[PDB]
Amino acid sequence: KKHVNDERIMDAMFFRSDAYRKTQTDEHWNPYMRQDTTHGVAHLLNNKFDIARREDRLSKGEQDLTERSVMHFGVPIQQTIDEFVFRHRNARGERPLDYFKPFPGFRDFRLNRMYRDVEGFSLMKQRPEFLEWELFTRYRAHHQQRRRIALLHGLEPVANETAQERDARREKLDEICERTPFDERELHTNDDEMQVSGETLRSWFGVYMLPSPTVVEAVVGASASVNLHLFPLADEMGTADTRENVLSSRYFNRLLLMEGFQNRISRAFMGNVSGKAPEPVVQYMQPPEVLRHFTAEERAMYEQYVKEQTSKQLGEWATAMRRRRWIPDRQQYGHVVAQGYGV
């Protein structure tokens, strides 16, 4: 019967596999018949050292060395993507809307993948609101003018650079960027993007989000948080500062403390979560669906295990907030009791 188990079929799938079998490895004379690791891996671990490195390797998590005895050239990323496009008839929903115009430049065939230049923008959360995308794209331009001037005077990041050089170079580049004109011909309008003007940006967002060098100075120099200058502070000639200069890092470094901005970017929690521990990611924190099944005492084992883990990382954040450090001059760990002032 079509797809119905039968006794001749049992006899047949056995006569087919083990036809005249003296042992499971009767046909293990052929090399590309022997090395096959489908139904296990034992037959290729022929001494105790083999299985010893096997288990040490599987403990340390490295890919089992007798596993690699068959070469499984995987499926190429290109084949999977190509098949997907073929099934879904060109991924028309996925191309960038510039794909669909005259001669999409080669950058316009690759899909709308989440390229990292949205790794940092705390402004837009998940759906950029009005002019939010346009300002994020203006700042893409700003960081690009950053890159231009950075390679310009040679402030490129260095493979083996240390922190002191890093922040020295940073405050070095901030000085020229925040003081050097921002280039406007670079302002390239993409697909379905609104091409907007600087004054409109400075009106909707305030000239604090689009600061001119003068307002950035007023932010970096003074100490107050009470002055988020959401409008133009006049120029040194008595006019409106119709000008913008490159986006550096020190200015946002100034803003990010004034709770007006830490909510403007909806990362407000920082006041409520500043000095406390994260939730312990306890391994095997089983759901109640099998806490139901941990027997009378395996449940006890489970709760003891998780309790010891939570206490571990909690005492760990205790030791994180302590910040005890090795004063060699006392050969000990000094725990600060108080601080001073500007000396």
């Binding site: 001494n47 050292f49 010893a52 490195r53 490295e62 060395l65």
Partner: protein, 223 residues
Amino acid sequence: QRKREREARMRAFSASCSNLLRLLEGGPFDLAIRLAQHGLYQQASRIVDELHQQRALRMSHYGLLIDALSAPCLGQRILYGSAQCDPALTYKLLGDENGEERAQEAHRWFDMAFALLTTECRMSGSEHRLPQATAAATHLVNALMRALLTCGYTHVSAVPDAVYDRMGLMGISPTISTYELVMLALSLQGNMKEAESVFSFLRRHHNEHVTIGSFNALLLGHR
């Protein structure tokens, strides 16, 4: 043909073993060297247990015994007979050969050698902390590592897990054999991500001191 070659090789090994046992039951230092070299630790151990009593030894005597215990003749025997002349699997197929007891012997012997070397440092008139910078102790390191690589997988991975760490802890400035055995232990461990790292430090610092045995460690570990 291969069978004849294996038989004629095991014949040489077994005849040597028998003639040696006959000498032993029926001079002593070459006897112990040959014993530990064919793989007769269990008899070369009591010889040295009484050679130690009368201070019949020095820094380098236990050292000699350590390297000779790694059983070169037995390595070549296993190699020809069981490994089918495979230099990697010769370590894996010697490791079954009492590699722990051969390893416990090599260890205790090395510690004895350290005792004797510090004893020499403090009897040589300059009483102070200087057994490490003695290249002799560094070569005890290299020799214990060579006598460990011949043993089980546990120790093959112990060479750069506890022998290297203890070396650094005591302050034994490493020799080329120590770096090549770092590499060869990592290579018979499978940790090429660490062996090529050792090689990077070398090529970027001491390529005049890289010999072909370290590239051998690589060609074995990638294999």
